[PDB]
Amino acid sequence: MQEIIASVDHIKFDLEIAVEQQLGAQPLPFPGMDKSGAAVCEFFLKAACGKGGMCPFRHISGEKTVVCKHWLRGLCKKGDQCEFLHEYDMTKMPECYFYSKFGECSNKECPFLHI
Amino acid sequence: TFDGKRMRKAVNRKTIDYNPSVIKYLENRIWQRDQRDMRAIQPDAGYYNDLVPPIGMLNNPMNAVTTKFVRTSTNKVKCPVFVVRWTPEGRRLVTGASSGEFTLWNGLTFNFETILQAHDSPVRAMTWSHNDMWMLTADHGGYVKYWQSNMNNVKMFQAHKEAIREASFSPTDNKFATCSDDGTVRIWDFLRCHEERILRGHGADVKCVDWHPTKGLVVSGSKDSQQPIKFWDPKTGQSLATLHAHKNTVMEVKLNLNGNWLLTASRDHLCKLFDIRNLKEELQVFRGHKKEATAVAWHPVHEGLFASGGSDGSLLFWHVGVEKEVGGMEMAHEGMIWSLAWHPLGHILCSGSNDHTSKFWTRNRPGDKMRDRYNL
Amino acid sequence: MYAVYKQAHPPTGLEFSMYCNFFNNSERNLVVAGTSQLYVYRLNRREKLELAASFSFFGNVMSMASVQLAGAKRDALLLSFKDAKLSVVEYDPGTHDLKTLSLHYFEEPELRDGFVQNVHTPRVRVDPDGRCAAMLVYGTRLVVLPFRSSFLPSYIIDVRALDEKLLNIIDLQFLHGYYEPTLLILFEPNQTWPGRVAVRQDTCSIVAISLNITQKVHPVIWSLTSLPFDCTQALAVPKPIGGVVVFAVNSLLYLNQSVPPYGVALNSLTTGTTAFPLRTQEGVRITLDCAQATFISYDKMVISLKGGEIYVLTLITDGMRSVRAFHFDKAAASVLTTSMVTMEPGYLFLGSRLGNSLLLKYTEKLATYSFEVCDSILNIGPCANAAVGEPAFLSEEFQNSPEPDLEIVVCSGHGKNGALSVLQKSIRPQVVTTFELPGCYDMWTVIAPRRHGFLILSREDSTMILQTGQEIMELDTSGFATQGPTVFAGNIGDNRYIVQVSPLGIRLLEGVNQLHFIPVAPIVQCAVADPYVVIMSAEGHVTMFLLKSHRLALHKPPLHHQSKVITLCLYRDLSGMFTTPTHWCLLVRENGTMEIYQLPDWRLVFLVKNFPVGQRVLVDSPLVKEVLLVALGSRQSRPYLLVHVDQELLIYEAFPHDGNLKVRFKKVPHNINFRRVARFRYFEDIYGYSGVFICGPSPHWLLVTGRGALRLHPMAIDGPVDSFAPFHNVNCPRGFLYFNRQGELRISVLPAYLSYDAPWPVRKIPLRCTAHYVAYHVESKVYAVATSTNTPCARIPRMKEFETIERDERYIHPQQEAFSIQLISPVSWEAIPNARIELQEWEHVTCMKTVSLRSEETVSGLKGYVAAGTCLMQGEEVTCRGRILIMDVIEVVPEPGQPLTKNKFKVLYEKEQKGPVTALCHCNGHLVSAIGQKIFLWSLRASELTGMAFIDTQLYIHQMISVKNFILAADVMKSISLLRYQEESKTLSLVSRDAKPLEVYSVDFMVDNAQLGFLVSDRDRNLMVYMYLPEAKESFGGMRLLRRADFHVGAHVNTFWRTPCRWENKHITWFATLDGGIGLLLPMQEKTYRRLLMLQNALTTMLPHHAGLNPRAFRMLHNAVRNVLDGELLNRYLYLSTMERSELAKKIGTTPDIILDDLLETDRVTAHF
RNA sequence: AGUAAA
Ligand SMILES: [Zn+2]
Ligand SMILES: [Zn+2]
Ligand SMILES: [Zn+2]
């Protein structure tokens, strides 16, 4: 009902213009920063980021098929250089070590794949 | 060897979950103007769901006198714990030990999460910035490291040639101050890791330092009785005042978030309160520590309430304007309590001790006959 | 960036009540105060509370007391505000307003002892003998205000520096029967809390200090040190018995100086919690936690418990005048009370914030009393949640209106007084017949031998007469003149005759037959009373006709011709304040002079020299267009004056003031904009209501009832109204007639489901349970309401094992909440049978919203379900988890005889989550949920939610709202985080956040042409607007949200909603407060904001505001970016006369026309609901 | 994968 009476689909917001153009973005100091919780770099995917390595926004690669288990716990040091997926997809979850090794698994709410 | 690969049976773990209390407070908030409209919690075990967090009991700070023991968290190597700090959202609690290691514990069930080899010398200082983005730590070798939430080290530099005892950020993240055993306080630019001012004049090793919440004022302790407490101007690097508060080594200096009160702890078995607007007299002297007072911590919610730690392992609670302690635990630890850290909500207090353990304390439950070893 | 605050609905809910001599010493009045509102009530003998006065303050009343000063003609009120402010006010005769006697400020930093957060409200107490008043400030400073230049210089007592150190003051009361003012103070020197009562058992004390005003010495007398730890309040016993009664949570104590303490235990929860000697009070099992008590007799006390139970307490006393026993009598149950006062004996008033405050009458029955309800005051309670929906019924003539037709449904009250309030700002008539009658511009309805027999309509050249019986048909027979226009038609002689005025003469009829015609400078206006008829010509000539027993006899009035009469009216006073039935003629002349004459004679009794200016008070001795003097209220006891002056409406209220007329008129504030056909249309009975209808571009209903409060309800639908008339017919029972601008005559009745005796037309729907959330389902057009009921708690969950609570018969069980979700039909405002979801035993609904989720079985993508988040509350030591409930409202074949049963609940998703579900939201067809310290974005499949993205967040997210793939999340202790979702990469990221901590109540958006603000409500009753400004230096790269607007709304806000303006892309952000009010934030352009800011500064500086409060300081935040205007202060410019407006405009270098254009456009664009 | 089972 809120969008029926007060719709904003016809309004282009300065917030939208700023996020799309990465206005105000500045290079990250301390090179090894995680970039976790940051938007992916639209420029890098489309044509070219420009900054490179120091961009506050993620530069992703299409070679990850397994979800990063450290990223789920919130402690991932590799950042963009991580070889595991940083997407919340519980179908590409890592296989359960305990189910694959010691028969059954302990917790009944195990996110890892029991195959 | 612990690598997370051996089979372990599922076991229910003790928790202190604040979500029911937050929900109850949110419900009461709608129809209750203040705590005067708040219904009375009965001292009966059946009133478990009537509990609210400290933000719901601003008129009675006695709720946050954490005398109920929850759990003791111990590393597998039995190393003394020097500093304990909660993450800014309270998700985890990080400890700093004499082995240079960081140990992470869950903020709800207080179980081991992960361990890091953070320093090559004992970890002495650990502080988060006001924007919750950076954790700054220092070790006994004089090195200062920058950390993120994911516990990844991004910058390292040597701030002092001797052991650094404490560090504290400015009101913004732009500057921080460190104290060391060389008798100096140094002002640093966070981004550039550049030494701006060197504050000399203490005459002995500086044991503590604190930055004012608003004004831009730095207060430090010391070992020598001639200059036990000094006030500094970070911009000019010149001493503003000398406070002869204690006759022994000053272990803690903690400025209250109101910007008026200075809390001090010393080896003369005393804690003192000062009004920084009038330093000619003491506001209050807190007596009741049988041994040296080695750690203090203001409550995040109640501005008059703070906890104190002692070298004998005692943990006392005080309020501003009250002569005697509002609570305490003789023999809470077995050894000097090095650091105290309140959970950001204020319902849990964590203590790190010279004994190789870290303990969690929460509010006493209504209807509890407090006959346990820490109470009676 | 820039906004103006407007108040749409005044706060409802009373916190303080007293019975004092507000007006004079002859009678006492009920004086009640809410937060910024003060009300004075008289009692009418059924018994009805009549509003006598009402005042607004730029501040929140924290304590209210009254005292009789020396040589005073009435009582003086003592009001406490803010942190330490004591205001002494009194009723001012002459004017009809408040007079501030003295202002006292005690906000020095040295009184706060270094504390910056004040948790103590200033509490004012008065000595029973009126010797002094005392206000406790910051919990440690006792301000003493001595009385005899009626006030002696005040002094401050430091309670920490007394004979005993007084810490943690619980309550303080002045005692009875002492030579000096003796203040009893209940305090807690060593504080404890119920979680720890095994090592600090009972530390509560009372002391009495004798206040020597002259010597300023306050020795302590009658100490007592070991009171129970849970003492809550004290009440001074009246003089014959004396002493004090102390309320504890589980015990009751009577304490006297010369007698040993006497106390009893109200339940078994005292066994291990206090060592104070307590006897078991047989027959009662209660607690006194938040209870209101007052003395109805010297030994009888009536107590209103939590839960609403009413008890009468008797102090059993022997011959030695010493209390020896207690007696409890379980009387009726009533409303949850915040206040309690005894009126005239036999009458008791219960003030309430949670439910309607009601007046009770108690009668002794054949030692024991019985209570009955006599009156109630409508209270939209704490507005927890609100929903905008479509009204069920609208006339087909209004379906083509470009503006939406909306209503507000609010969760109000609490517990047994929980309800739903259906709120509509304007009035929508129910049209039952429309007649297309071009040409006729004016009309009248007359009563024929109280139905209406004829409808007289006047054209430019002819008069059309309609006979209104079983069917309305034109009457072409003789009788009424039809060859020309009609000036006025009406009844005379007690509805026995019909009078008709033509431009050529005056005609009398007795139905369809003309009785006689008197020829009569054409007639332009006629005023008719019983039995007086006064007509005015175009040149001001006035003649009078008397109905002589019938016939009309000419009586030439002896009026002077110094100035020509421009307009006049006739008034018949029934409830007589026009003293020195009576008949009067209010007259306006060309020179701006307004005169009143007694009608039998024509002697002057009242004169005003500058009437058109619009003076705020009219005392005895341009282009006025119409005046109407009419009496309203109960038995027509409230005369009002309505004036039309150059596109301005003046409303005046008459009040007595002492051979001239002993009355004066007070200007009444309003927002009605006027930007010969009579515009003021009085009606005696329209759906039982009496009042005046105002025609013009902005039609309004002016209603006054037995309550005595003025109600101004707009009728903006159907556009401007040209003419109006009451109409009582068989097809139109107690209805009305009005012509729109398109020449259509509509036969309408007022819709019967709303009450028009409230600030807004409202319908309260009693649920008898707490209403938490309300959501409107656009499909099927029904409301989903999450409710809760309290049941005794029987088990203690462990971690699951359950422990049965085994206690004794005097034990009191804790309350356990059981939640349910109900469907409410807007057609009949009833719960739909067999449509009710019952939550699990300990499950609490933490959020409930209507969410638009993607689906394929729709023309668009979205579907519009109802989503609820729950958490299983089972204590601190059990892990808290919850569920997400996704429900659809479907259409099914109704059961025979139950048309409501066409709608049923369809549960699509119902599963337990991996943590507590604390907030819900939707984002571009996805479901956003706050589960624990993470926020998840879900996609709804056929029957399952699939995780798309997540992000770590703060301690506890309780509020989330989204706009265009952006999400605003609010934390309990941290302020706000701005989130963004990228669909292509399935990335949920943090854009910005507020670094500083803040306790947020709710969040919304502020919408401009391109600027998007983030509106945040505060625990300190503040409103803040944050903006994302990545190019600003203050925002360190955009990672920090910067606040750009500040405003202190003296109320807590928990719900927001947005509407567009009636301003291209600006939206109005509405909110409902927890004090029962409704406010607005309207975005403004910078130039208009600057002009109105100069106006606001001038109004703050140059006006005598009530209680001496400062409007600018009240609206200051809690540094402060004050970019929000105060429209309630800007309304004061509308209330000023034209001369004062011109003076202020010249002072600030602008034009009154420009100021009015700026001010009236804000009222125009905000006319919703 | 860096301690997922401390
Ligand atoms: Zn980039
Ligand atoms: Zn990773
Ligand atoms: Zn598994």
Residue numbers in the entry:
A (entry chain C): 1 to 115
B (entry chain B): 42 to 417
C (entry chain A): 1 to 45, 63 to 165, 183 to 400, 459 to 541, 570 to 640, 644 to 672, 680 to 710, 781 to 821, ...
Q: Which sentences did the original study use to describe this structure?
A:
The most critical sequence element is the polyadenylation signal (PAS), a hexanucleotide typically 10–30 nucleotides (nts) upstream of the cleavage site.
We have determined the structure of human mPSF in complex with the AGUAAA PAS hexamer at 2.5 Å resolution. The overall structure of the mPSF–AGUAAA complex is similar to that of the mPSF–AAUAAA complex, with rms distance of 0.58 Å for 1,656 equivalent Cα atoms in CPSF160, WDR33, and CPSF30. The position of the CPSF160 BPB is similar to that in the AAUAAA complex. A large conformational change is observed for the G2 base compared to A2. This also allows the N1 of G2 to make a hydrogen bond with the carbonyl oxygen of Leu75, and this interaction is not present with A2. A rearrangement in the position of A1 base is also observed, although the interactions with ZF2 are maintained.
